[PDB]
Every structure is written in structure tokens, then in C-alpha cells.
Symmetry: D2
């Protein structure tokens, strides 16, 4: 059968010659019998001194860790990034230092709202997270399959996640929550139009693009800084699943994406993505018609063309899923010198959110789980102890800074880039920014007639389950985007109602 | 629109008169604005001073707790147990003390292998766990929808659970693991025959029976002990979903059971169960043809009739799912005086397994989560502290026993019943016990022709995905049960393999 | 016998009439016998079904939580704050709203570096943390017994804490670490001079002052803001322990402060503190000779007089130490409307550091441990779940914002005060700020001859154990403060080294 | 200066030639400046963008783990055990398999009741825990400096521990609790007499003996079983501190034992212990005048002589205290084939108590913290996942047993020895066992006049702080042991009162 079906057979075939290992306890003590327990006679009660049973049973009882608060259902793979073009005039990061340089990568794909156990082929944004193991530490590009997101302020993210998830009382998916949140926040129209198009259900993880979706800052060796976007487009082509096909697959094969990626890598059909950047100077960031740090906007390709950088290749399947996929952690704040953060508020909130959730989910010392370790860099600092400190704890080195005993020193060349900001320190309302121009451009100029009609059908078929007043508010926003948009959606809703 | 769809509308309607509450932080400080963050200028970076954002963000980051290692996907409800018949001659537990007395209950239904997010209408055993809030402490009857289980020794339970879950490398369901484990352990044939019949997919949680699968010990006020089984049959009738209907429902409505139970309770259609016991004397346990403490065997009804006890009724929906259903914990060791454990090895392992996993999953002080608290009895002991110690940590009372300062004292009437056992202390092999007699009885006498044909078709349609040698071993076990069983399964496998 | 010695006798005396409680398990099941375990025969092995022993033992195995990373050794008490003067022109916080208003408080005193188990009467700064339970949420004033601290940048705090604690290899106190850090960072001279004076060892917790030590921002109802300091001076008088007396007490009574506070409150001798503020306008902050947000500086009293505000009274002893003292958590970010943070970098770091460490030490839901709960305010937000959720989890209320179903709304009057800042966003060096002027003022004008000579003796007696080059660097800093300071310390060091 | 105080100087001297390391974050990213934070101008507020500060600060905030519920204050060392005599007729354990074989060991010394920060030189029992790294798994001999203990039933251990610690309200040491518990349970008289003698305060950890204190079962290769006791006597000699000297040292040097052990090993003065066993046949365990599995009784030397086995030597100091001493865990259930548990009820309770508390204190995967790992054995079983799994999660091997794919198998030779027991299954009262015979033997025949007088003075000076009726009950128990004992204690109490 398929290589995923033959995992145990393949393992047995590689271990055909050798004799089976001796079964031991967690402390290495050999086990005499692990099929029966110690009782007082044949029909008597169990004994405490059966420590083999207790040792196995307690560890079984402690197997689960909390799942991710979002993107719980996921698939992992490994490979490398290779440089194909020179962009050293924009960035001085070691990952781009010369043409042909290779950096090992780790990649996790995921959905957003479904828990670990839900189906892969549902309408949802897709996570595309890449971990670069560079000599200047780990670089995490925690991206999506869309260049934009629903909201533009990080304080609304927990509310959006709650509204996309189950009702707090009935534990059911509630369209009222979803559509009340979306109609009260019309800045989500762009990503809603993206989500309900054909690209909302990709045909596996190999047939979709990846976007960092934030503005980032590139600094070169001379100290000059530019703003950038990150793109990586699939070399396999964009492929999508129809609504009926996805509905069938969700029942027949709830793990469609995992099986597809594993069977592709196992047969040597390695998927690749071509890595691009967009570049915006500060002067033309001043004159951009929108806010260039707004997560609901893209940079048009005519004014900001793609610049090739390299390519991402995935050629290795995980050996153990729990150790390499479930325990992997991506922190957007993991940036080497040459890559920095832009003043995008969403990115600013993400700078705190991810290590904070990783400490809770995995542990304070999660950075030295082997899949998360920066094994191509040298870690030396004044941090000590913590639960599950699996090292020499940096030995007997001095643990305070500054000192006069030869402990590690700071590197002045790794200093951040300086920007002067104007304005007072307060909360600025961004709910009334431009919400319809790029949505109108997508509706009129990007989609053709059939894609547009399918998008309207999908929106109506999801929105018809909500209350009437939420329907009117959503239709009002859609009519603000385009009158035909709202009118078609309202006609389909009238048919449903 | 069903009442489940109108949850927010109903909540808004009960609060029509009142003005909305003031939005505060976790420390109660009122919040000025929670739609925008604090930046230096309109297009500047974020400030640490925005403690409102950090306070909400970290709590959102800490929302998830580890799911149950088994029975992760579940549905909760609440109600009461009522006594309708007198069994005081068998047990002295306060829950059965007189006819007509009521005890509040909490119930969780669940599947077994699927995690959170998996579908409800799949072929699986169903959990039926009942928590009695009794004045003599909490009593947990952690039952299933089948009277039997796959294995009879508790040390094989982690291996069986692993074999029914995802492959450790590919993270996929692996028929090889499932059927290799089942063919290497032929004592699972009885529960496999149960599982692949029509009752493997119940039509919601209201149309299925509940069984305390282990044998238990009942002690009366005179110190006499008997062995017992627990049954509670649905008053709604047994109803099952066909394979095609369940397949359609799994993708159309993955939360079919939760919605069904909630909409039943919300409309006033309260599901009910009739509570029964089987009773075996110790002489009858000596003369029983099998081991009476074997989890792969039942007590036949013609020799051990059902004795009515009471009624289980569920009439209240959960108010908050996470606090009442996700955080509820059932410990089989929670037994009041009058109810004890039998020497069933599975039950003995479960006596340790559940509080240990509860301490891991919820916390050391999980017993004082409000849904888990024994609020109808009085807690007084010499246990102190631990993480999240609420109330007053039993005040300044003496924390050592014995003492001379009026601290709580042991109650001699609550002493366990004493039994003399014979034999050596070692591991006794039970893999070669009788594995086919009751399976043959179920195959020949219980099922009719159509149910038998569907059972064979289901078994073949699952086993076809396994390797050839595992197929032959499983067919050998089925032929050991009955020649026609194995012959039909092999013929269907031959059709599938070509 | 003191009342602390008679705790158990008193508890027995209040329970003279009533009969002792029944000893139960954690689930409320009555215990037959808790002095012997279940064995097969008198000389046989232990049984799993002895669940009483397992429950008690497993709970005993989990009663330790991690201690505080600093201020581990501490003492707690409770009382109230009362307003005696009108400061409504400066702040609109409800805690100061009218004269005579009372607010319940909780107070923890502590040392800094010693772990839970170390002695009380050692040379160290003392923590003085006050938690106000106001109707606008909880307000925590996490203060010290000194108005200043050793460093002025929050990124050096873990290094300073490590240097004051045990060596990473030998696990011993290492004067090399302490004095190398202090000599490499000359900004610590002011707080070092404070620490090695007579007030470095107070005579219990009732004979010492308390300082917020940070500049804070007070905003009134009209939107005008001022900068403020917080003071609360002991009404019992400043009293200190000599070096020899403290050394004797450390081994004779390692819990001197706890016993002193408990016996004071138990006999009705309630300690009191008078609450003051200093007020700086923004123009005065512009014209201040130093940085007014520097943690190594004080505001001189002749230019910024004390303004009386209120009264802190402690009159209730803790009932259970672990529940009310070990589990209490103070967050400087807990500020009601009318009180805000200043741009002091140390305060900015603390704003993140304290809830972050509370989530790890106590749990994500630590704010609803009863001693930490804002029980005089109404908590309503969109935060849900988390481990050990011990309420209705806010029921079935909508959990997203904004919504259209009557869920809690933001309060616009609780918005923060707005300030425009100038300059680039980068790291600014503050190591070369003024380090010796206020230290010289303290050395020359505050201390008399005997206090000065004792201070020099204490400094030399601690610094003698360090290496020679660190001794020269420290002596160089002391000579920078004053030539006689450094010369006296060097002469005493010369005597010690020979 | 002692070598302990020159730790940083020594580290700097071994790192004199090399250049200092570059200071990085936990993810390996080089740090530009770690002395100042990022603010909005010289006097502005702090930025979230300062991820270096947050990364260091959160880890500092997560440094502490819960201390041990008992024996919190401790000192660690490392070395080896060597076989000097042949006892293979009693045991088939690989650790004793031939003369001259070495096995690496890890040792922790500790007090009992004091927490971290408390003084070393106080009157208390001393823990002497030895971890053998054996090719048949790890063997932990969790011993004490006394052959006996206060109680004989494991269900009273939490009550005794609570009574020896702080009052639940005042958080102070309460003599009422201690002496009420001791007078209500007169089986503690033997260990109380031991504790209040001169050996209650050892002169460091090198001048004291070690005892397993339990009866254990030794099984040879032919299946024959015997009962045994474990002894290891100090080759440095028994040395004790006087009450006044210990009181002075507690104030002056609260870490006297740690410094003494470290400076002994650092200067090459390696402490050693001689390893002995007592042997009781199953026939003569029936005719023993007491219960041979009673923790309040010893086996007399004239009837059960010591049999030499080997030497315990400590020659290596810890490199990092937290990783090697604070995180080390000893499980009495860690026993290789050839060593088993006896029906001692205290040992049976300890079989459950220690792994249960280790899972809470350190983590579910505490057995693979490097100091706890059985690195000289091969670990292979069907346990998977759990928090903080750091090696491979045993790869893609089959995780269920039995299987048909070559996974590890049980070893029938490692089966336990089987014993038939008689009697009912219930709770048997052991409070009325013999409580005074061996105490009387110790009082009359072991101690001389001066030691006896000092013991009486110490007991009186501790008991005078308790209430009067507790004093009478304790005096009644002491008079039961010997009339002169109780009369002297009562006269001293009368002087105090
Ligand atoms: C029923 C009786 C006992 C129980 C339940 C018990 C329980 C415990 C527990 C929970 C710990 C904490 C371990 C850790 O957190 O690392 C501990 C430590 C310890 N116990 Fe016991 N104990 C008992 C009696 C004894 C006896 C009889 C001995 C010696 C003969 C002993 C010697 C020790 C030692 C040396 C340690 C420190 C181990 C280390 O250095 O990590 N205990 N005990």
C-alpha cells in the first residue's frame, strides 16, 4: 500500500536482523512480565509492590499536554532553504549572506479554529510556519496562506478567536457569534472575501502559497533600513477542493493533509516554494495611500514587484510526530540581526503572545526541546535553572552581568535600528480606516464571473444560519463594498429565508 | 430555531431590564478602551504600559488544559437519582436508605478514542459516568454502554489505548495496530462482536443503556457482603444509526450528541434510566462456571435476574461547558460505606489510575472544583495546602493525627469488610481463560439473521485494510468462535482483496 | 506563654462544646481507620485498594509550590486604611474620595535574598507590600523600607538578584559576586550606604518605615496630572537591632519578625503607619536637578514636603498562613483610575514582571485565590477558562467584544492620561548619571559621628572577604563619594588583611 | 582562601586564554546591549519591542521549582562503589557480580524538617541517599544516618511530618505539636533516644554512618531468597558537635555541611564508607523475638554479624548545584533483579510515595533529567509523550504490546520471587507492639554515664517548652522505658518549670 500505511512494516524491515530489545522500566530495570499483574492468589486483589504496572500507568496518565489555543490541528515536515539571489543590499542577515547558502528549516501547516481531532478539509485560513536554523540563532517566519487578516488591532484577537469557536454554554459552533463579530467589525471584509473564495479550501498543504503578511524591517550592513513583505509561492501550483469534495473528504479522510504530505515526501515528490520579497522605502512609506503597517491591506504588485530571494524545500518526514510536530514552537520575536519588526500593531502584540503561550503550553525551558533548540548557534547568557533544565545549566560560569571573570559579553554590532516617532502616547482608533477599496478591487478585478458567483453562494450559505438583524448588517457592509455584492447575497438570503 | 441556536438571544432576553456591566480587568480595575492599544503616535510601537492588553492576552494564552487521555470528546448533563425499591438487605449506603429519597447527579457521556473536535457519530464504545452527591461523600459510577470490555488485565490498557489511536510517526489511524492487537489478544472477541453490531453507533446518548461493567461488593448493616452488577437501561428505548446515516452525520453535524441532549433537556424532554442490580452470593461465586470477576464475561439473566432499584433523570443543561463538563472528574475509588470494590483486576487498576490522572490534568486540588466538590457532605481531614488551595485551608485546626486538641476522629463503623484470600503472591496468567463460549452464545442466540449479516459485513469492512497475516489470525479466532462467523468474514475479505 | 504558643489550646477552647468532626477523605467518604494500612495478614504487603492511604499520601506529596524568586521569607497581617485628609485635588481614586473612608488592606513583610527557612534578623532591605481592596478594583502598593534601590535599569535586576544569592556551583553565599557587582555598578552606593547603616536591621516589622520608592502619577477629575511619591512612617518609632543582638537572635529565634507581629496583634497592640505623599508638578519635573524618575534619587523634604493623607492599621492575624500569606500576590500594575505609572524604567519592568511570575508560581487563575480576589469590586470581562476555574466561568454570557447581546461595556471615564514624548526609540545609557551627590549628602548631613563610624565598620567587615582588586575598586567608589569614607574603609580593610 | 570561595577565580583561570563568548538570547540571537532598555526618548516609557528584556525577565520569573516536602536542605557529591567481597550466594544483582567491579554513584545528604535556607548544624536525622548507575538500571538506596525511624506505619508519616514543622496559623515551630505526637505514639521512643544523643548533630556529613534501615530481600541465581539489612559506616570516624558549638555554627555558617564536603573533595580528601550487610534466613525470621520487618527495631550484632561487601567513595564535586543536586531524585522502587522489597509496611508506602512526588516536583519525564538518567542501561518500553520529552520519543517504534513488528520483549529471568502469605486482608493494629525493650537496651548497655546524662539534659531542654499534661505523658513513657530515665527527666523538668 502507501508508505504511510506500511510504517510498522518498514520499521520491522530495518530491524529484521537484530534481536528485539529488552523491555525495561523508566529507570532501566528489566521487566519479567508485562502482561499480568501481581495479585493475592489467582482471584485476589492488586498489590502496591507491582511497581512495573504503576510506572507504566502513571506515565500513560501523564501523556497529554494542552493543545495550542489556535492552530491545534497540524502537520509537520522538514527540509532546507537555499539562497538563489543577492539581497544583501537590503539585509545583512547571515541567512542571505551568499548565493547557494543552505539553512535547515522546519515547517508546520495547520488550520485555525478546529481542535486536534477535527477534519483537515474545511474552510479556514491555513498556517504556514517556517523555522530557520541559522548561525545567528533561530529565525521564525510564522505565516499564513493569506497576505492579510481579519482585524488590525491585537486587542481584538481573543474576541475574534472566541467568536470563531464553540458557544460557552452549548459547546456548539454558533453562526450568530461569527457573523455578529464580522458585521460589527467591517474591517474583516477583505479577509472574509478571501476566505469564502475557492482558495479558502486548499487541496492539501502543497498547493497553497505562504505569506508573512506583516510588514517587516530589513537593515543592511551600513545601517540603512527598508520595509518588506515576505512571500513564498508554491511550485506545485494553486489547487483547491470543491465544497462537495471537501465535505466528502472531511468524513472519509479527516487527516487528508497529513497523509498527502507524508506520502508525497515518502515517494520523493518533494514540494518547493519560491521565496520573494516586496520592498518599500521609508520615503514611499510616507506617501502610501493607506497605512503600510495595516494587516488588512496588501502592497499592489504594479508598484511593489516581487524580488526573488531563494526557495524552500521539504524533503524529510517526521520520525516521531509528538516530539517534532506537537512540541514545535514558533516565536515571531525570534529574529536575527538584519531582520526587525515594523510598527504593525498586530506584530507588536504577537511579539509578546507567542513566548508567553509557549511557556504555559510546553514549559519554561521549551527552547531546548530538540526540535526547538538553536543547534546551529551557540547559546550563552545569564539565565539559569527553571523546571526540566536539561543541560549542564551552563556549568559554574558566573551568572551575573557585568562581571570581571570572563563571562559572555554583549555584541555591539547586533544593536537595533533607531527611529524617531511623533505623536502622543495613547490609544488611537483605527476602526474607521479604509475598509472597502481593496475589497472592491479584489471583487471586481481579480475574480472572474464564476469565482465571484461561487463566492457569493458560499457567503450566503454560511450567513443564512444567523439572525435577521445580523444578516442586514452584513448585507449593508457588502453593499458598501459593491452594490452587486450585497444585492446578490441578499437575494440568496431571501431564497434561504 | 432550536433552543441551542438561541443561547445568546435567551441570555440577552433575561437581561433586558438591566444595564450592561462595567468591563474590568482580572483585578477589577475598570477598562477605559478595549478596542485599541497604546502606541506612541498613530503609527508607533506598542507600550508595556498597556497592562489591559497584557492581562487579557496572557489569560487567553493560558486557556487550554490537557484533554482526557481517553474519552476526550464528551457531553454533560445534570439531574437526580430517586429510590423506587428497597435493597437495604444488600447495602447500607445512604443513597439507598429509604424509598423516595433523591440524590443529585452529574452525568458525562463520551466516546473513547477520538480527541476534542472529532465527530460524535462513529463506531466506538460510549462512556456513561454518573456522580452521586451523597451525604456520605461522592459516589462515582464510571460506566459504559456495554457490560464488558476488550481486555481483562489492567496492565494491557495503555497498549490497547495506543493501538486504537494514531500511529506514532504518521499520526494517522492505523488498522494494522488495531487488528494486530486484537488478533494477538483473542479475549477481545466478545467486546469486538458487541462493538461491530448495530449498537456500536447509538442514536445519541438518550437511546443507549449504561452498565457498571465490573462486579462490585455490597455490604449491609449486619456486615454481610454480596457481589453485584450495576445496570441502568434507557427509558427512551434502544435506537441506533445506520453506517451510511452515521457517516453523513459525522461530516454534517460532528456534535450530534451534544446538540441532541441539549435540545432534549431544553424542551423539557428529560431522558430517564431505570436502575437495576444483579446479585451473586459468595457460594454462587464459588460455583460460577467462569471467573465472576472477569470483565469479558456477563452474568446470564436467567440465573441472575435484574432487581429494580431506582431511576436516573437528567433535567438540567450545563450553564458553562468548561466549568461543568470539561473539568468534571469521576473517580471509581469514590465509594461510600456499603459499596466496595471486588477483586476484579481491571477495577483494582482503575482504583489508582483515575485520581492520578486527575491530579495531572486538573491539579492537586481538583476535588474542590465546584462541579467535583462533595457539597452534600462535610470534608474534615489532615490534608493541607497544595496549589490553588481555596476556602480557608481548614483554618488553624491541628494538622496531625492523633492529637489532643479536638481535631476530627475516625469513624469505626466505616471500616471495610474483611476477606481471607488463598494462594501465592505473584503474576497469574489469564490470557488462556475461556474466550469463545459467551461470544458463541451472543452470535447464535442473541442476534437474528439480519443483525448477524450486518455484523459480519462491518467486521470485514474494517479488517480489509489490515495486512494479510493479521487477517488470517483474526479469521482463525472468529472460526474458533463459530465456523460460519469466520467463513463469512473470510469470504467477504476475499471479495475485498481482489 | 505568649498567644502564639497557645494557638492549639485556644482552638481547642473555642470548640469545647461541640463534638469532634468525622474524619473523611478528599471526596467526603468517612474513614474507618487512619492509623493502620491494609495488608494481607499481619506481616504481608500493602494493597492498592487502600485508597484512604493513597489519597492522603498523594495529597501530602503535592503541598509544596515554588517559593517567591525574591522575598521568599515573609510575614502577613490584615487591617484597614483610613482617610484623614483631603487630596482630591491631586487624585480622583475612590480610595481617597472622602475623609473617614475605610478600605480593608492586606500586608506582607519580607526580607529579600534569604529563602523560606532563613533567619529574620539579618542585614537586608525589607519588603512592605500593601493591597487595598477598593470598589474600583484592587490597588497594590508594593513598597520597601527604603525610598531607593541599588540599580536604575530593570534589565540588570536578575543579575543583581543572582549576585546576592548563592554561587551556582558551591551553593554558598559568595562575597566575590556581591562586591564585584556593586563595584562594577557605582549607582548602588546610595542604597549600599542605607543598607549598612543601623536601619539595615530593623527591630521587627513594626519599627520601620515604608516607601513606594517610585514616582507615580496622580490624576484628578479634571484631567490634570502630577507626579507623586508614597510614604508611610511607623507610629511605633524607628528601632533597630545591633549586629551582636541580631546575630544572637538569628540562631535563637529565626522567626523573630513573625512572632513579634503575631504577638503584637494578638494582645491588641495594633501597629500603625501614617500615610504621606510628596507632590511634584510637571514644570518642577522639568526643572529638577536630577532625573525625577531615577530610583537612586530622593526628593528632598525642604523642597517637596510631606502631605498627610491617611492611616494604615494592622489589627487581624492570619487564620491559615499558607492560604493568606504564602499565596498572596501583589501586582504593581493593579492601579485604579486616578493612580497611574510614571516613566521610571524600573516600574515599567515591574509592570510586566509581577503578573508574569504570579502566573507561574500560583497559576493562571491566581487572581481568584480568596486572599487575592477583588471582592469589593465587580469583575466582568471576556476572559474564560484556564486551569482551576473556580466559579461559574461567568456563565453563558457572550465571550467576544464587541457584541450585540448585552455583554459588559467599556467605561470611557477610565481612560489613561495622555503625554507627548520626544526623542528616538532606542536604548539610552544611564550608568553615568550622578552617582555621588545624594550619597555625600547622606554621609555628611544625615548621619552623626557614631552612626557614620558604625556604617564604615559594617562595610569593612563585609568587604574584607572579597578579593583585593574588588576591594580597591569599591574603595575608589567610596572615595569618590567622600575621601574620609574611602580612607576609613581602606584603613579597616588594611587591618583585616593583615 | 578555601577552594569553595575561589570558584569564579578558578573558572576564569581555566578560561584565561579564550575570548569571552557572545551573549545571546534563549533562541541564540546575539544581544546588542543588555545594560539598558528601549524607551521613547531618554525619559519615556518601555517598549514591548525590547524582547531581550522580556526573554531574560520571564525566565528569571520562572526559576523556582517546588522544594522537596522533606529533606529540602541538602548537599550533593559523586563517586563510585567498588566490590571488595563476594556475596553472589545471596544476590545475583550485577552490582555485586564480581570482586573489583566499579559502579558510579551519586549521593545527596540532607536534614529532614528544615526548608531551603535553614541551618545545617541542628538536631535532626540526616538523609544519606545513594544512586547506583548499574547496567541493569538504576538502584536507589535512600538511607538515613540511623537504622530506625519514629513510626512503623506509613499512614502516620504525613501527620509526623506536619507535627515536626510549622504551626498552620502562626507559621512557627510548635513544641506542643512535636511532643503531643511523640507522647501519643510511644513507638517513637527508640528513635527519640537516638536523636537526642550526641549523634543527633553530626560533625558534617563525612563523620556519620548510613543505613538503609529497612529489611530488604536478596535473591540469588538459584531462586533462593534471604532478608537483609544495609549498612555503610564512615571511614573518617564518628564525630559530633556539641550543643553550644552547633548553636554558634548555625548563626555563623548556616551551610557548614555543604562547605565541608566541597572543601574536602576539592583538596583531594575523599571520604569513604565501608559497605556491610546483615543476613536473616526465612527460617530464623519466624523465630525472631520481634517483627523482623519493624522499622523501630534493629537486628542485634551478636546474632546477625556484619558481612563486608564493598566501599563507597566520593571524589567529584557538583559542577552546577541546581542541575545535579536540587533536581536529583531517588526512588526506593528502583531495584535491579536480585534486590527486592520486604513486607515492611513503611517500605511498601515508600514504594508509591517517591515517584508520585517526583512527578509533581520535577515533571512526568523526570527520569531523563541527566543526573536521573540510567545512562549505563538501555531504556526500551512502550511509554510515550508526556511534557518535556527530549531524546526521540523512541522514534517510530510500535507503541503497543504484544505486537508482531519486533518491538522490545519481556525478559522472563527478571521475574520476582514468589511468597505465600496467610491471614485476612484488613487493617492490623501495630501500635501495641514492643516499644521499650530495645530502647532499654540502648539506654543501659550502649551509652555510658556522660552520654546518658547529656541525653537526659537534651530531652528535658526540648520538652520543657511543651504543655504540662504532654510533659506528664512523655515522662510516663520514659519511665516505662526505665525508671531512672523518667525520674531524671522529670527532675530536670521540675527545675525548668
Ligand atoms: C512511610 C515512610 C516515608 C515516606 C512516605 C517518605 C516520603 C518522602 C518524600 C515524599 C520525600 C521527598 C523526595 C523528593 O521530593 O525528592 C522523601 C525524601 C527523603 N526520604 Fe523519605 N519518607 C519516608 C520515610 C523515610 C525513611 C524510612 C528513610 C530512610 C531510611 C527516608 C529517607 C529519605 C531521604 C534520604 C530523602 C531525601 C532524598 C533526596 O536526597 O532527594 N525517608 N521522603
Amino acid at each position: 500500500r502507501d508508505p504511510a500505511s506500511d510504517q510498522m512494516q518498514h520499521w520491522k524491515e530495518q530491524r529484521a536482523a537484530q534481536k528485539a530489545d529488552v523491555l525495561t522500566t523508566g529507570a532501566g530495570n528489566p521487566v519479567g512480565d508485562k502482561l499480568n499483574v501481581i495479585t493475592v492468589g489467582p482471584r485476589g486483589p492488586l498489590l502496591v509492590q507491582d511497581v512495573v504496572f504503576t510506572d507504566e500507568m502513571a506515565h500513560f496518565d501523564r501523556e497529554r499536554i494542552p493543545e495550542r489555543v489556535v492552530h491545534a490541528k497540524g502537520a509537520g515536515a522538514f527540509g532546507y532553504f537555499e539562497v538563489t539571489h543577492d539581497i544583501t543590499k537590503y539585509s545583512k542577515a547571515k541567512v542571505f549572506e551568499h548565493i547557494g547558502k543552505k539553512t535547515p528549516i522546519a515547517v508546520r501547516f495547520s488550520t485555525v479554529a478546529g481542535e486536534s481531532g477535527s477534519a483537515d478539509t474545511v474552510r479556514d485560513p491555513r498556517g504556514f510556519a517556517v523555522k530557520f536554523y541559522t548561525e545567528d540563532g533561530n529565525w521564525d517566519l510564522v505565516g499564513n496562506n493569506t497576505p492579510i487578516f481579519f482585524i488590525r488591532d491585537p486587542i481584538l484577537f481573543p474576541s475574534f478567536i472566541h467568536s470563531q469557536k464553540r458557544n460557552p454554554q452549548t459547546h456548539l459552533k454558533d453562526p450568530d457569534m461569527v457573523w455578529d463579530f464580522w458585521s460589527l467589525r467591517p474591517e474583516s471584509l477583505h479577509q472574509v472575501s478571501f476566505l469564502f473564495s475557492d482558495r479558502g479550501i486548499p487541496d492539501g498543504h502543497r498547493h497553497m502559497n505562504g505569506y508573512g503578511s506583516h510588514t517587516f524591517k530589513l537593515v543592511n550592513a551600513n545601517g540603512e533600513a527598508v520595509y518588506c513583505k515576505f512571500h513564498y509561492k508554491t511550485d506545485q501550483g494553486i489547487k483547491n477542493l470543491s465544497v462537495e469534495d471537501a465535505a466528502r473528504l472531511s468524513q472519509e479522510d479527516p487527516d487528508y493533509g497529513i497523509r498527502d504530505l507524508f506520502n508525497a515526501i515518502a515517494t520523493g515528490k518533494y514540494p518547493s516554494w519560491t521565496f520573494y520579497i516586496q520592498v518599500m522605502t521609508f520615503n514611499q512609506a510616507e506617501t502610501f495611500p493607506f497605512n503600510p503597517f495595516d494587516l488588512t491591506k496588501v502592497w499592489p504588485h504594479k508598484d511593489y514587484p516581487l524580488i526573488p530571494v531563494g526557495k524552500l524545500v521539504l524533503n524529510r518526514n517526521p520520525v516521531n510526530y509528538f516530539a517534532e510536530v506537537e512540541q514545535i514552537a514558533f516565536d515571531p520575536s525570534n529574529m536575527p540581526p538584519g531582520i526587525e519588526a515594523s510598527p504593525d500593531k498586530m506584530l507588536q502584540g504577537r511579539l509578546f503572545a507567542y513566548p508567553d503561550t509557549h511557556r504555559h503550553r510546553l514549559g519554561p525551558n521549551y527552547l531546548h526541546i530538540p526540535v526547538n533548540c538553536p543547534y546551529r548557534a551557540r547559546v550563552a547568557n545569564y539565565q539559569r535553572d527553571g523546571p526540566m533544565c536539561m543541560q549542564d545549566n551552563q556549568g559554574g560560569a558566573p551568572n551575573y552581568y557585568p562581571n570581571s571573570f570572563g563571562a559572555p559579553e554583549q555584541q555591539p554590532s547586533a544593536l537595533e535600528h533607531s527611529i524617531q516617532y511623533s505623536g502622543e502616547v495613547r490609544r488611537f482608533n483605527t476602526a474607521n480606516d479604509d475598509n472597502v477599496t481593496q475589497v472592491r478591487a479584489f471583487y471586481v478585478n481579480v475574480l472572474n464571473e464564476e469565482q465571484r458567483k461561487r463566492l457569493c453562494e458560499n457567503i450566503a450559505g454560511h450567513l443564512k444560519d444567523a439572525q435577521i438583524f445580523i444578516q442586514k448588517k452584513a448585507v449593508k457592509n457588502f453593499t458598501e463594498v459593491h452594490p452587486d455584492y450585497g444585492s446578490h447575497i441578499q437575494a440568496l438570503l431571501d431564497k434561504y429565508n
